[PDB]
Design a protein around this nucleic acid. Sequence first.
RNA 1: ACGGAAACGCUUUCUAGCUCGCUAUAAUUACCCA
RNA 2: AAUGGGUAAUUAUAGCGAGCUAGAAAGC
Lengths: 217, 251, 345, 121, 121
Amino acid sequence: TFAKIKFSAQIRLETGLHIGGSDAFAAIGAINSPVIKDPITNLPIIPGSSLKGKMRTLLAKVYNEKVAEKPSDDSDILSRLFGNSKDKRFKMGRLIFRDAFLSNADELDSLGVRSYTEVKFENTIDRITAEANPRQIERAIRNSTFDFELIYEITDENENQVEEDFKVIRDGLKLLELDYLGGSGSRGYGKVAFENLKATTVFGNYDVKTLNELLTA
Amino acid sequence: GLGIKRLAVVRLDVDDLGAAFMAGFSQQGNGQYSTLSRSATFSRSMSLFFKVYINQFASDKKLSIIYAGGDDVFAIGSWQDIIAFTVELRENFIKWTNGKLTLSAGIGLFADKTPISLMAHQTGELEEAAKGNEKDSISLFSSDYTFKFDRFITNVYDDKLEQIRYFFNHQDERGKNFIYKLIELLRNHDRMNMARLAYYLTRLEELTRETDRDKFKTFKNLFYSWYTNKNDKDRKEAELALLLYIYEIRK
Amino acid sequence: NDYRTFKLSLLTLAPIHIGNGEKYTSREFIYENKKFYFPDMGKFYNKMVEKRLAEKFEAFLIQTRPNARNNRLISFLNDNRIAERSFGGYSISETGLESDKNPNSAGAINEVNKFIRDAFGNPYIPGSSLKGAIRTILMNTTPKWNNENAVNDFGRFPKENKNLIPWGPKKGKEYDDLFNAIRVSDSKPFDNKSLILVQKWDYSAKTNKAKPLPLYRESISPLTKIEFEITTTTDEAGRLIEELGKRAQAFYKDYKAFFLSEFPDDKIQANLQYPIYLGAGSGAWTKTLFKQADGILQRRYSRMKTKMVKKGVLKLTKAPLKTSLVKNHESFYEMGKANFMIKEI
Amino acid sequence: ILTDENYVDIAEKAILKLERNTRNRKNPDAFFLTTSKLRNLLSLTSTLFDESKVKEYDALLDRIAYLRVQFVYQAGREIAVKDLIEKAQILEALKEIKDRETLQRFCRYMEALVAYFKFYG
Amino acid sequence: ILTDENYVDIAEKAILKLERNTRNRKNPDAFFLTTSKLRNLLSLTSTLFDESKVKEYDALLDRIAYLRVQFVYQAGREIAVKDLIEKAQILEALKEIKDRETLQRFCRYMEALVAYFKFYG
RNA sequence: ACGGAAACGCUUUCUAGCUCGCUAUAAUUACCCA
RNA sequence: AAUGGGUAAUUAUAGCGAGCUAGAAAGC
C-alpha cells in the first residue's frame, strides 16, 4: 500500500525573521542584507530548505547517540525522514517540505502596514574609539502568517514506523518554537508559533483520527 | 570490481617495414651491407619475433591474439591487459631492434557485444591516424589522444598514472568528482581555465583535513605544473592518465 | 533540554533613545497644544497641494525668518488657515520641561530623532540593543577580556582586534561561539504614550554649567517595565547570564569610581535594581572598554569640538519627575540609566 | 535629463565642477560640501529606491512629490547644498520622473553623485 | 583595453604588481586587500554575466552603469581597492564595453582577478 | 533492366540524492557654530 | 547674556563561494 499525508500548519511570526539572500546590485545607502522574497509577488518567503535543515540540526542533536559530525551519519530515526545520500536504502526523503508563502497579505494591510518588510538600522559599536558601522538589514514583520505544508510519505516499508514518526515531526515543530528559524537569531529574529497542526491525507486512504490527538497535546 | 566493463583491440604495425626491406641495410656503409645473408637473417628474425614471441609477451594476460606476424598484429582482449601487452611489446621490440624500427599501435576501447567488424575498422582508422601522427605513435582510444611510445610508456602510463594512483589511493576525501572536474577542465581548455583551475585547486587545498594537507599541496602544485607548462605535450598526458584512472576505479 | 531560558524585566530610570537613523527637521511637525503632531509629510503635501498652495510651501521651507515661533510650520497653518490636523503619523504629548526658553516662544523644538518602530505603528526595544549593552558588561567585567584587546598599531592604530571573543566557524575547531549561546530576544512592543522627547543637556566639568544642546531625541518615559528573554544554549553562557546580577554592579563600581566621580552627586541617580546603560545618550564610556580606551578615544577628536581633556562631558536630559528617581531639583536625568532583574524560568 | 548610458558621467563632472576652498591649503581642493549632508540627501531617496523595487509608481508618486520639497528644504539650509543641486542638475531631473525605470535611474544618479564625491577627496 | 588573448594575463600581472603587507609576519608577504572587499565586487559582475546570456544587452545597460558607480564607491572607501582599480585598470575597462561579448569579457576579467587573488595567498 | 530490392541506430531510462544564507555586531559617537 | 540653528564620522566589516555519490547501463 501507499499513502501520503499533509500537515497544514501556520507559522505565525513573533518578532519576525530575516532569511538572507545576496544581491550584487543593491544600493549605496539602502538595504545590504535583504530577506529572500518571491520574484513576482515580492512577498517574503520562508523557503523549505531553511525549515528542513533547521529541523535536521534540532533533531540531530537530540535523536542521535553517536555525535554526528556530518549528515549521512544520523541514527536512521532521522535518515528515514530526511534521507542520507551514502546509505543505500535511505536515499529518498519520505519528508517533502514546502516553501512557506505568506498568507496574510491582506490581514496585514488591515493594520497600518505600508510595506510587508521592515528595514532595521543596526550599527556595530567598535569597543575602542567608540565608532559605528551601520547597516540596514531587512526583515519580515511581526503579525505575519505563512501557510506551511509538509508532506509525509507512506509505503509498505513502514511496518510499524508511521506513528513513531509523529514523535519526530511534532518534536521538530515544537523545537522550532524554541530555536530562531534562520536569521540573526541571537538578536531576536526567530520566535515562531506553528498554529493549527492539522494533519490530513491527500493520497491513499489512511486513518488520521488517531493522528490529530498527538498534535494538540 | 575495479574496472570498466570494456574490451580493447590493438592493431600494431611496424612503421616502414617496406623501407626496412627495400633499402634496409644500405644506410650504414657504401651499399656493402644490404646482402642476401643479412636480408634472410633479418627476415627470419622478424618472423621469429612477431609470430613466436608474441605468446611469451602475452602469456599471463587475458587477451586473444587474433592475427599476428609480418608487421601487422591484431589482438582483441580485456583492456588493462591489452594496454600492458602493447607496452610490453614495444618495450621488447626496441630491446630487440635496438631502438631502430619504431612500431605504431592504435588502441580502441569498445563496449561488450559490439561487432568485430565495426571494432576492427575503427581500430584500423585509429592505427593509420597514429602512423600519420609521426613515424611512431600510439593512438589510445580516440583520434585526438595520440602520443608517442617514447612518451606514453614512461610519462603517461608509469610516471603520471602511478603518481595519480599514489596520491588518490592514500586519501579518503576527494573522490571521483574531483577527477571528473579535472578532466573537464583539461578537455575544455581555454586560457581562462588555467585561472579557474588555479582557483579550484587553491580552494580545495584548504578544504581538506588540515593534518594531511601537504599531500594535496604537492599534488596541486604538480597538477598546476603540468597544466600551465605551455608545451602542449604535458597536458594531454594528464587527461589520458586521468581517463585511465577513472577507468581503473569504476565500480 | 539544554536551552535554559530566562526572563529579563527592565526598568527605565532615565529616558532611553534607541537608533532609528532618521530624524524630523524644523518643519516636519505640528504643535497645536501640549501634543506634538508628527504627520506623514508626503500625505501632508498631498492634501495641501490641492489649494495650489504648495508653491507657498516652497517659499516657507527656505524661509529663515527670525522669531522661531513663526518658523515651525504651526505658523504656516495658523497663517494660511489650513485647519484639519487629520493627517497620518503619530502625535505624542510634551515632556513639558525641554523648552528652557520663555513661555509662548515655547514649541520651537528643532530636530527630533525618531524612536525605533515596527511597521504597525508601535515602538519596541530591539533585542540587539540589549545584547550590545550586555556584551559591554561581559567584556568589561571578565578581566581576561580587557588587557590585550587593543590595536597593536596595525593601521594608524585606532582599531580594535575584535577576535578576543569566541567568534566564527574556525576550521578544524569545534564550534565554540559563546555569544551565539546568548540569545536575547526582542521586547514586547508597547504604545506611544510613554515617549516624551527629551532634549540633550551637556553638564561639563571645569566650567560648572549645564549648557543645553539643540538635539531633541525622542525617548522612553521613566518607570516603564519592559519584557525581555535571554534563552541560552551553553552552560558556559549560563555562567555569564547567572553572574549578570553581580557583574552589572561590578561594572557600575568600576564606572562610578572612574568617570561619575569628579562630577557631583546630585546629578547622579540611585539604582534600585541591577544597573545597565542602554544606548543613545549614555556616552562613549558605556559603549567601550573604558579602562583601555582612555588614550585611544581622545586621539580621534582632532576637530572643532575636541573632548575636554579626558572624560570630558556628562550627558543629562529633562523628563517629568516620576517616582523619587532623582535626588535633585530641576529634573536632570542620566539619559540611558536603566535597571534590570533576571530570573530563570 | 538622464538616460541609462550617461548618468554616471553627468554625475562625474558635476563633482569636478563643485567649488572648493580657495583658501585653507590643508588637504587642498577640499570642498565646501561635506560627506554628511550628501548622505543626508541620499537618505531621502534610499527608501524610495527600495519602494521602486517592491511597489509600483502609483502608490508612490506622492512620496516623489514630497521628495522635491525635501531637496528644496535641504537647498535652503547650506550654501554648498544650494550649489550642488545646481551644478548637478537635481531639480531639473526631478521634474522628469515618469516611471519606476526613471525613479530608479534618478536614485542611481544620487548614488553616483555620492560615489564620485567619496572618490574625490 | 583588454582583448581575448590577454585578459587573464593582465589579471595575473596586475595581481602580482599589487603591493604587499609590510607588517604582520604571521602569513607574511600577504595582501592589504581582504577577500571580502573583492568578492563584494565580483558579486556584481557574476550576476551580470549570468544575466547577459538570458537578456539582450540593450535591456542590461543600467546594471553596467551601476558598475562604474559601485567600483568608484568601493575604491573611495579604502585605499586597498583604490589601489586595485588603479593597478588592474577596471575603470578604463568600464568605459569600453558597449556590447555583449565585451561585457562577458570584462566579467571573465573580474573572475580571473579573483582567481589569481585567491591563488597567491 | 542501377551489387541492386525491401529496412526508423531504434526501445527503456527523473540531472537525481543529501545540505539552515549562516557566524559575530547596541544607529551610535563627539560638542558646540553664527 | 539672550536670538537663530545643529555640525562632523562610519553607510556594513571578516569569512565560506559549493562538497560528496552516479559519469551511461540493459536489449536487438
